[PDB]
Amino acid sequence: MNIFEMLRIDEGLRLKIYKDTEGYYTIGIGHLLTKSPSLNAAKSELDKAIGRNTNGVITKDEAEKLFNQDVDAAVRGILRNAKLKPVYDSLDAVRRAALINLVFQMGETGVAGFTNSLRMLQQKRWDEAAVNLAKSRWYNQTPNRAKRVITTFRTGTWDAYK
């Protein structure tokens, strides 16, 4: 297991624009296209993303290319973030994957705001950090995925995901 297989299990793959859990226009492997309500704003952002007129539909290769760029930006973002970088630096390889996952889903800014959980992760207080993470809109809105990520932080293994 690795970051790509973990996020592919969490986000799925869809080759047609769809709406995410929040109701946003998305495509492929959790690639958010726009928060606007217009389907055309979404098709325009899609075509700009892919470099071709897509009519709202892309191929598996194209999905995978967006996914690759998105994991990359997620990682880079963490490393540039003054609040995230130190936490990342302090963790082991599995838990690093978990942070990435949380950053992919909710963006650097949000994650950065989880002040208390971040400090707890940094100190290596696993159980406490898992409890704290659960007291969030995040966990209440997408509880199964959140429990998987949380277990990943708690354990340091990939158990939540075999």
Binding footprint of Cl ion, residue count (CB under 5 A): 4
Q: Which of 10, 20, 45, 108 is catalytic?
A: 20
Q: Which of residues 127-146 bind Cl ion (CB under 5 A)?
A: 142, 144-145
* Dihedral sign for Cα atoms in the order 87, 120, 97, 106: negative
Comparing CA positions, the residue from 64, 49, 58, 56 lying closest to residue 8 is: 64
Whole-number minimum distance, CB 54 to Cl ion, in Å? 13
Q: Binding of Cl ion at residue 49 (CB under 5 A)?
A: yes
Is 70 marked active-site? no
Cβ-based nearer residue to Cl ion, 74 or 91: 74
Q: How far apart are CA 30 and CA 18, in angstroms?
A: 10
Cβ-based nearer residue to Cl ion, 35 or 85: 35
Cβ-based nearer residue to Cl ion, 58 or 87: 58
Whole-number minimum distance, CB 51 to Cl ion, in Å? 10
Count other Cβ atoms within 10 Å, centred on residue 50: 17
- Is residue 72 within 8 A of residue 56, CB to CB? The reply is no
Count other Cβ atoms within 10 Å, centred on residue 117: 24
Is 20 marked active-site? yes
Give the alpha-carbon dihedral of 121, 126, 129, 133, to 10 degrees: 110
Q: How far apart are CA 149 and CA 46, in angstroms?
A: 29
Q: Is 4 annotated as a binding residue?
A: no
- In the shown chain, the binding pattern of residues 2 to 41 toward Cl ion, with x for contact by CB under 5 A and - for none, equals ----------------------------------------
User: What is the binding site for Cl ion (CB under 5 A)?
Assistant: 49, 142, 144-145
So which residues are the catalytic ones? 11, 20
